[PDB]
Design an enzyme around this catalytic site. Sequence first.
Site, PDB file in Angstrom:
ATOM      1  N   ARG A  32       0.815  -1.210   0.000  1.00 61.53           N
ATOM      2  CA  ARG A  32       0.000   0.000   0.000  1.00 61.53           C
ATOM      3  C   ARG A  32       0.846   1.256   0.000  1.00 61.53           C
ATOM      4  O   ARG A  32       1.963   1.283   0.540  1.00 61.53           O
ATOM      5  CB  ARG A  32      -0.936   0.043   1.204  1.00 61.53           C
ATOM      6  CG  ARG A  32      -2.159  -0.871   1.035  1.00 61.53           C
ATOM      7  CD  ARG A  32      -3.081  -0.858   2.259  1.00 61.53           C
ATOM      8  NE  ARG A  32      -2.422  -1.298   3.482  1.00 61.53           N
ATOM      9  CZ  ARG A  32      -1.834  -0.487   4.360  1.00 61.53           C
ATOM     10  NH1 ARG A  32      -1.827   0.853   4.181  1.00 61.53           N
ATOM     11  NH2 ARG A  32      -1.260  -1.014   5.432  1.00 61.53           N
TER      12      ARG A  32
ATOM     13  N   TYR B 201      -0.710  -4.253  -6.877  1.00 56.90           N
ATOM     14  CA  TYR B 201      -0.554  -4.859  -5.544  1.00 56.90           C
ATOM     15  C   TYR B 201      -1.851  -4.905  -4.796  1.00 56.90           C
ATOM     16  O   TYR B 201      -2.553  -3.896  -4.717  1.00 56.90           O
ATOM     17  CB  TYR B 201       0.445  -4.109  -4.643  1.00 56.90           C
ATOM     18  CG  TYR B 201       0.304  -4.525  -3.179  1.00 56.90           C
ATOM     19  CD1 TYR B 201       0.824  -5.739  -2.731  1.00 56.90           C
ATOM     20  CD2 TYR B 201      -0.404  -3.726  -2.255  1.00 56.90           C
ATOM     21  CE1 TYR B 201       0.672  -6.151  -1.411  1.00 56.90           C
ATOM     22  CE2 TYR B 201      -0.563  -4.128  -0.910  1.00 56.90           C
ATOM     23  CZ  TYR B 201      -0.028  -5.346  -0.502  1.00 56.90           C
ATOM     24  OH  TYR B 201      -0.156  -5.767   0.807  1.00 56.90           O
TER      25      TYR B 201
ATOM     26  N   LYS C 196      -9.570  -3.352   1.419  1.00 58.04           N
ATOM     27  CA  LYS C 196      -9.336  -2.120   2.187  1.00 58.04           C
ATOM     28  C   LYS C 196     -10.233  -0.983   1.688  1.00 58.04           C
ATOM     29  O   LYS C 196     -10.847  -0.260   2.484  1.00 58.04           O
ATOM     30  CB  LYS C 196      -7.865  -1.667   2.132  1.00 58.04           C
ATOM     31  CG  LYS C 196      -6.835  -2.689   2.670  1.00 58.04           C
ATOM     32  CD  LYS C 196      -7.253  -3.233   4.042  1.00 58.04           C
ATOM     33  CE  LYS C 196      -6.062  -3.949   4.711  1.00 58.04           C
ATOM     34  NZ  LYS C 196      -6.413  -4.555   6.049  1.00 58.04           N
TER      35      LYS C 196
ATOM     36  N   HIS D  23     -10.674  -2.917  11.183  1.00 59.91           N
ATOM     37  CA  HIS D  23      -9.512  -3.707  10.849  1.00 59.91           C
ATOM     38  C   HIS D  23      -9.267  -4.743  11.958  1.00 59.91           C
ATOM     39  O   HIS D  23      -8.271  -4.678  12.699  1.00 59.91           O
ATOM     40  CB  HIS D  23      -8.315  -2.739  10.720  1.00 59.91           C
ATOM     41  CG  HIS D  23      -7.095  -3.342  10.086  1.00 59.91           C
ATOM     42  ND1 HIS D  23      -5.852  -2.760  10.218  1.00 59.91           N
ATOM     43  CD2 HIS D  23      -6.917  -4.442   9.308  1.00 59.91           C
ATOM     44  CE1 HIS D  23      -4.953  -3.504   9.587  1.00 59.91           C
ATOM     45  NE2 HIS D  23      -5.579  -4.499   8.980  1.00 59.91           N
TER      46      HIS D  23
ATOM     47  N   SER E 260      -1.429  -3.231  10.663  1.00 62.28           N
ATOM     48  CA  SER E 260      -0.860  -4.037   9.594  1.00 62.28           C
ATOM     49  C   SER E 260       0.462  -4.640  10.050  1.00 62.28           C
ATOM     50  O   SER E 260       1.307  -3.966  10.697  1.00 62.28           O
ATOM     51  CB  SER E 260      -0.692  -3.194   8.324  1.00 62.28           C
ATOM     52  OG  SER E 260      -1.926  -2.591   7.955  1.00 62.28           O
TER      53      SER E 260
ATOM     54  N   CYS F 281       1.067  -6.760  12.470  1.00 61.63           N
ATOM     55  CA  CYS F 281       1.269  -6.842  13.937  1.00 61.63           C
ATOM     56  C   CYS F 281       0.601  -8.079  14.594  1.00 61.63           C
ATOM     57  O   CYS F 281       0.327  -8.102  15.812  1.00 61.63           O
ATOM     58  CB  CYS F 281       0.844  -5.522  14.612  1.00 61.63           C
ATOM     59  SG  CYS F 281       2.048  -4.126  14.327  1.00 61.63           S
TER      60      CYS F 281
ATOM     61  N   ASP G  10      -8.795 -10.249   9.206  1.00 67.90           N
ATOM     62  CA  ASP G  10      -8.436  -8.890   8.786  1.00 67.90           C
ATOM     63  C   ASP G  10      -9.543  -7.822   8.861  1.00 67.90           C
ATOM     64  O   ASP G  10      -9.243  -6.748   9.211  1.00 67.90           O
ATOM     65  CB  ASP G  10      -7.794  -8.925   7.391  1.00 67.90           C
ATOM     66  CG  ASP G  10      -7.058  -7.630   7.009  1.00 67.90           C
ATOM     67  OD1 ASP G  10      -6.064  -7.384   7.576  1.00 67.90           O
ATOM     68  OD2 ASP G  10      -7.485  -6.987   6.088  1.00 67.90           O
TER      69      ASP G  10
ATOM     70  N   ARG H 180       3.039 -11.953   0.167  1.00 67.51           N
ATOM     71  CA  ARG H 180       1.725 -12.430   0.628  1.00 67.51           C
ATOM     72  C   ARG H 180       1.342 -13.784   0.058  1.00 67.51           C
ATOM     73  O   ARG H 180       1.768 -14.150  -1.020  1.00 67.51           O
ATOM     74  CB  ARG H 180       0.634 -11.407   0.187  1.00 67.51           C
ATOM     75  CG  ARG H 180       0.746 -10.004   0.820  1.00 67.51           C
ATOM     76  CD  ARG H 180      -0.005  -9.859   2.126  1.00 67.51           C
ATOM     77  NE  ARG H 180       0.281  -8.561   2.788  1.00 67.51           N
ATOM     78  CZ  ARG H 180      -0.269  -8.177   3.941  1.00 67.51           C
ATOM     79  NH1 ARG H 180      -1.212  -8.934   4.530  1.00 67.51           N
ATOM     80  NH2 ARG H 180       0.083  -7.025   4.495  1.00 67.51           N
TER      81      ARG H 180
END
EC number: 4.1.1.32
Length: 624
Positions: A89, A237, A246, A266, A288, A290, A313, A407
């Site tokens: 991002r 991406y 998102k 989130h 993100s 974590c 997520d 990913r």
Amino acid sequence: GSMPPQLHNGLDFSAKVIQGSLDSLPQEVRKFVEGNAQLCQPEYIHICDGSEEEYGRLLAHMQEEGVIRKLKKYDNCWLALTDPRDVARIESKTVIITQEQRDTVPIPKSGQSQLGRWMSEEDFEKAFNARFPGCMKGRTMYVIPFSMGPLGSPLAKIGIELTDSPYVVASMRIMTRMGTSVLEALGDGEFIKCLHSVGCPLPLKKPLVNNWACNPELTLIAHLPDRREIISFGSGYGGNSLLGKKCFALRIASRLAKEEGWLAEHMLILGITNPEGKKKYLAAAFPSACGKTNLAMMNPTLPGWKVECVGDDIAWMKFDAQGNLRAINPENGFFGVAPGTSVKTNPNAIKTIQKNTIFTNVAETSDGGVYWEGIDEPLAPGVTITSWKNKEWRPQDEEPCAHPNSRFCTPASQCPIIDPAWESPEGVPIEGIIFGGRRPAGVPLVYEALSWQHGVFVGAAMRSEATAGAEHKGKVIMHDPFAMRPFFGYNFGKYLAHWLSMAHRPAAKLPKIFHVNWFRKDKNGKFLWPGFGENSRVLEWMFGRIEGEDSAKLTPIGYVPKEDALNLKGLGDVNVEELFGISKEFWEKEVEEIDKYLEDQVNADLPYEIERELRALKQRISQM
Ligand SMILES: Nc1nc2c(ncn2[C@@H]2O[C@H](COP(=O)(O)OP(=O)(O)OP(=O)(O)O)[C@@H](O)[C@H]2O)c(=O)[nH]1
Ligand SMILES: O=C([O-])C(=O)[O-]
Ligand SMILES: [Mn+2]
Ligand SMILES: [Mn+2]
Ligand code: NA
């Protein structure tokens, strides 16, 4: 949809449709598709049906084009390597369009907001005209009808994404419910309009890097909530191109949630069952990179405990008539960080990802498998590694074999511990909400909020080391309120007020709110807590507290476990002194930092209740 009028033959795109039928699209879907075709000038239009044959063939096509590779060690798994300018991002190119700036972000005293990026409608129109006209020349425009949430769910919302990227198509098939059944379910109903282009019309004006079409200089990810449009240019991406995730399910959806009385967050959602046969659902917002995905599909080390995954997520939540906070996962797959993933840290993911999975920017082994930092698994002598940069790589080189934000993209239905209610239209009842992030210093393993208002403050106050999910480098401690800094669809001060208002509604059964820190380090830089599966010991404490167990002691920051209340058996070596320590000097510094941040960044939109909680915390620390 009906044939548009025309005096010539330039508006009706029927002759260019290579799958499906514009005549059979709902009217407004046809208008969306055709209007954007007239603009982007694709050579073909492919209306996605979501079939396995469509998927198989499209994969095969990217394969022969050198855009993806088959990972022959696994079952239907694939690898894409991107242009290294297009790997995450980009928060600085992610914008929301509203009439007034204050509707999108609080007006910061310092003049630069860290809680979103606003662009005027007129500025956006200019940016849009400099990008999209003719942008799909010589490409196929794919039309992806997709549902966020199970086809039914009261909570579910339909989008149409138009893209020139087959990679986006394949990924959306995994990450959303995609195809013909979605159109049948939409009918003449409302949908989120999502437009995406990689920004490389043919013939190519710029050299293509690693067969990955993108336009970094022109990258722009825009959200127009009044128009119900998401418009994204120049990036392939995930976070930038899978528009349901998102863009829709957090940014647009949080604004809709505010208006309509629900929540879009989130957060992972997990179901945890104890040795006494009781199950509770919890949600957790960490920033993100974590640990949400690791926690959501945890393999608990504690005997008699089970964890099941609803989502990893995104959470959509609403109080029902009974007052329970009910949550659904609007996603259909997991778009997880690969590096760090091992039989040790996330064995459940290791199982899920060996079929029907797309990998991006990981290394490839010579026998057709995947590799990344912290995979923690030896290769046979003679097996060699190709890095994500498509170069030969050895374990003793300059750089990582996989991108730090590489990913996997995997179907949720495959996860061996997928929760049985993960597609229930009713959602699951959330009994606690966990905040947390990376703090190497000062913040103990776990604590509990003193009240709803205090818990909302704890969310607002969240800080965490920068990660690789976006453009931010190094390890500086950043504010990331509610783990939503990159994702607010509207003014953060108003979002605080929305959360606070939950306490005022009828029969609301408010969840317990906790804060965790998996990441505290000693003076040597060593983690004080093993984490991962051992985090079940913390969840056990949370479980009993939710039941009303007398297992907490009051401190200035909230309730913590009493001595011996945490199960530390099998972890005899743990430095409890430091891990659970609360220092007056640290917390004095911390509360001053929070005060300045909320004053600057939230200012006139900071709810009185949050400023009150700050004052109270500050007072409690002063009395240490
Ligand atoms: N030390 C430690 N690392 C962890 C723990 N949990 C997760 N991680 C690591 O943190 C990184 C990201 O974890 P994820 O669970 O994928 O984070 P996420 O919150 O799902 O991230 P986004 O998908 O970017 O929103 C990985 O490298 C993990 O291995 C933990 O308990 N302890
Ligand atoms: O992709 C994600 O989940 C992120 O960046 O938070
Ligand atoms: Mn995320
Ligand atoms: Mn994740
Ligand atoms: Na490539």
